[PDB]
Homo-oligomer: A and B are copies of this chain.
């Protein structure tokens, strides 16, 4: 599917995965909750968002604003 850029460990069972995912000729930044399933593998969930490259700077500035 997508190439993993960063895996941020939330807990023993959960991570936020930031990946590049190509779709129909555009490279999205996918930010997604991945959780360990009954087999023990982390698997992506539907709790995630696709950021096209032109919005990525605004999203980062938003997170900086949200920092304390």
Please give the residue numbers on chain A whose beta carbons come within 8 Å of chain B beta carbons, in ascending order: 5-6, 8, 10, 16, 18-20, 29, 31-33, 46-49, 51-53, 55-68
Contacts and interface: CB of A to CB of B under 8 A. Distances in A.
Q: State how many copies of this chain the complex holds.
A: 2
A16 B65 contact: no
A66 B20 contact: yes
Nearest to A28: B66
A17 to B, nearest CB: 9
Nearest to A56: B67
Contact of A65 (B18, B48, B49, B55): B18
Contacts of A33: 49
A62 B16 CA distance: 10
